[PDB]
Amino acid sequence: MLGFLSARQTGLEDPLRLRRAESTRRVLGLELNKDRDVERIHGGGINTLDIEPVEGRYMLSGGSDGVIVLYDLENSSRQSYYTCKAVCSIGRDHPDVHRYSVETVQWYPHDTGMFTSSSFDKTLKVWDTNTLQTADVFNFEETVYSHHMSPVSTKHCLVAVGTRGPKVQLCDLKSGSCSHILQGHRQEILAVSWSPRYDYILATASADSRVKLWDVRRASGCLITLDQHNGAVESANTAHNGKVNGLCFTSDGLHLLTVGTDNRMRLWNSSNGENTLVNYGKVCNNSKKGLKFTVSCGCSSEFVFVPYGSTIAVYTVYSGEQITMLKGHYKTVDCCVFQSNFQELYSGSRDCNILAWVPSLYEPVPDDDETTTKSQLNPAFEDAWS
């Protein structure tokens, strides 16, 4: 540390280096609930989490109960230990509440005043955050597994919806259009994800074992089908020997991660679909529904956090190296989300907990001359062989 501080003060190293090094060290030090609980509002499993992109203060949660909960993550108490309290909820008393489990919540990418929700009740809903009233509602023939709004598109406001139907659907919130379908897939579409680099490029994953990249401006059909063997454009390509149930672009958009029920994670070049041949080993993935997982941002290494049964596995994206297993939950983890500002990970599970994983690099320090106001050696940490 003191070396980094000296090098920064003297301009020997760019201020980038201390910042990225310490961010990486913090990710390596994640510990369960060290400073922080999250308030138990849900009665069911936590299907989905989304941290607000503007300030990172607020987290939406959706669950198998159909409830949507909005949490405040900032410690506005003066204590070193605190609870992330629920600001407000769309509970079962609300008229517009979802009838069946809520499978994706996403903030509007450009300000916090609106958010979107989807559910196995075959709806996509648009919510006014200040009032928690729906502004628009879209209905579908089939249960929605996933939806996404483009994180970078200013030009268009399209929601991609993946359903049990074989056709991807696109809803235009500006016009209210929901007629536009993409017709290339053959089974249920389990994950959809817009490129963070390009306004118009949508990745889609399906139980047909295919990941397809689309340019939604075109009348032409899809661009690229990912072939895990690298050899041919559509006739037989598969990304996994199983269902493909999760997508995550890397934070630069240059690669796409995919996870599937073959228990493998695979890294792809997003500009042409080449399998980069990074091998992570067995990544346990039994999930028959979409799996949400996340990369880090702003670290010296790009990490990926992936549900691994009841654990969260951490890998280095490019090296394939398994770094740690975060070992908290009692049932399968369904989502995790990364707070980029402070390198804190939140995780939802079918055990109904939301758990915070927080960098725990060192303890509060005593003064040895104190009587009892020290940083206490609690007797729970003591042996008792007598």
Binding site: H110, G113, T129, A135, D136, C157
Partner: peptide
């Protein structure tokens, strides 16, 4: 307003206004 006070594009308030006007009378 607690939310929408800061931008990270169409502002939420105008997209919401279009959706409301489209769904009300």
């Amino acid at each position: 307003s607690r939310f929408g006070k800061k931008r990270n594009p169409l502002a939420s308030s105008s997209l919401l206004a279009k959706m409301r006007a489209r769904n009300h009378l």
